[PDB]
Ligand SMILES: Cc1cc2nc3c(=O)[nH]c(=O)nc-3n(C[C@H](O)[C@H](O)[C@H](O)COP(=O)(O)O)c2cc1C
Ligand SMILES: Cc1cc2nc3c(=O)[nH]c(=O)nc-3n(C[C@H](O)[C@H](O)[C@H](O)COP(=O)(O)O)c2cc1C
Ligand SMILES: COc1ccc(CCc2c(C(=O)O)[nH]c(=O)[nH]c2=O)cc1
């Protein structure tokens with residue numbers, strides 16, 4: 363029995379990795395993720411310049427999940443590029459680098475300088491589309507024309523296979539449209555579904571107060587709240603993008619949750635809130651739990667059941 | 676002491692009611708809701724003609740909530756109109772009738788007939804802006820131009836105060852746009868936030884199968900999964916629509932959950948999944964629980980804390 367995967371011309375011991383933003387902002391964090399049993403890691407979504415991010419408190423967790431309005435705190439592109447170029451031990455596991463420029467021009471500038479390092483070292487790019495553009499407009503992946511522009515410009519500037527991190531959608535017409543935009547771009551080789559469920563609001567009954575400071579308490583939701591939304595999006599893109607990989611993210615706390623992602627279509631499975639809460643030891647637990655489900659079902663490899671969710675009648 | 680309130684020129688014993696679609700399809704259901712301790716009831720969204728809805732199983736519930744693709748099964752507008760006109764006992768509690776025509780014309784035809792019954796009996800209209808998916812276009816509330824057309828036509832045809840049932844939004848720009856549309860219409864006197872979170876997917880690990888038969892298992896989510904989503908929409912529209920009431924719906928299982936909805940801005944609080952699971956007994960429990968939280972806090976009225984959620988700095 364085994365959890366090995368071979369994709370994007372890399373080899374992965376198991377499908378598990380951190381979700382961007384969790385345990386991946388500093389060198390310490392990346393060394394930690396590298397030392398863990400995960401099959402890969404992704405760096406914190408970065409901007410050209412370093413950012414402090416939003417005022418604290420800006421992340422909070424609870425039994426059913428988490429809320430965050432971090433504001434993209436990060437060390438800046440040059441730091442992540444350097445980690446990729448000079449510090450990461452690729453003999454341990456593959457590295458993804460996530461970018462989240464605040465304009466199409468900022469993303470283009472970063473990808474242009476990433477490319478030679480991707481070529482030489484094998485770092486894999488995750489472009490975060492679930493991200494601000496012009497304030498008062500919707501996030502980029504909710505504005506199909508902007509999304510198309512970003513992918514056109516990044517495809518031309520980068521010129522190498524990459525993937526994209528997508529917000530969740532809630533309407534079949536959006537699944538259809540979004541997948542059709544993605545399928546215009548042959549360099550988009552993987553699609554990660556999903557980023558947080560946007561602009562939720564957690565309120566504490568005792569204090570009668572919101573629990574995070576930025577945006578009057580509004581922020582993105584992760585964890586147990588979002589599993590069925592995540593599964594829907596993984597399966598929707600799996601069905602609509604037959605020439606691309608889908609990576610699943612959202613609501614993974616157990617090997618069973620990971621199994622469901624994989625049934626839906628996931629290749630890699632990313633862990634955000636649960637990793638933030640439990641720490642990197644979660645990866646040994648998830649591996650063991652997934653293997654136990656596989657042994658009970660008689661599955662020897664992930665490809666035996668990936669995308670094989672049954673429908674009724 | 677007691678939870679009675681006055682809204683929309685009617686008196687309510689308490690802020691609780693069923694969510695449209697739950698316990699409200701047949702005369703038996705409407706009589707049961709009427710006999711319960713709820714403050715009001717709403718009928719099943721209807722169409723001009725009866726509908727059988729989608730194949731079964733089309734609803735399933737789990738510890739964290741529910742998934743449904745009911746397909747608008749209903750007895751047809753003539754039935755709900757006759758209930759409103761001849762059968763409902765207005766001395767017991769107010770009645771809302773939910774309409775969900777498949778085109779603007781069908782909604783105009785129903786509301787022209789409802790208007791004199793609204794005038795004579797005081798039945799209240801809830802216009803459901805969600806509908807079965809049609810390839811190539813989004814649900815009406817997710818197409819702002821369509822939404823504006825529907826409200827323009829219904830406002831003209833009906834001519835009396837009414838409300839609208841909204842799906843959730845996830846992006847602040849969308850909140851700004853949707854609220855600007857709604858605020859064009861002075862007869863829209865209440866907004867109900869939210870309908871189910873669209874197109875989630877629940878998978879059963881043992882069977883490796885989706886749990887509902889329609890739409891390859893995709894369906895709207897309710898219950899615990901959607902509480903922070905629901906609160907965010909309630910508060911976003913409460914802030915943006917100061918001349919309207921906001922009715923909260925989503926994730927209410929306890930008087931604490933109802934308390935949070937009211938803190939966010941809810942005037943009435945609707946109960947879907949939890950009502951489907953627990954039955955109409957739930958209303959006495961929610962009343963008791965809400966009054967107990969009020970007493971512990973020193974609140975004597977709902978007005979003392981409605982919309983008064985606190986932000987940080
Ligand atoms: C504190 C925090 C920071 C995040 N930062 C990023 C980020 O920089 N880039 C990104 O693509 N997603 C980011 N996300 C989203 C996660 O990658 C993930 O999509 C989301 O949390 C859902 O997965 P989960 O249910 O396992 O938490 C962040 C999430 C959290 C909780
Ligand atoms: C079985 C079922 C049928 C529903 N039918 C309708 C409907 O006819 N009209 C409507 O506006 N909402 C309908 N809904 C949505 C609910 O009114 C409510 O918005 C949603 O379930 C979220 O609330 P909850 O978390 O309390 O379940 C239905 C929900 C369920 C579970
Ligand atoms: C509302 O302010 C922001 C600013 C940047 C982003 C992109 C980074 C990001 C963040 C974040 O840094 O706040 N959190 C998430 O849950 N997902 C993300 O993709 C998301 C939201």
Ligand SMILES: COc1ccc(CCc2c(C(=O)O)[nH]c(=O)[nH]c2=O)cc1
Nearest residue numbers: 744745746747748805806807808871895
């Ligand atoms: C995308 O599929 C549908 C089908 C019917 C409707 C309208 C009725 C309705 C239903 C339903 O009858 O399936 N379920 C809900 O959760 N909310 C509703 O508003 C809304 C959406």
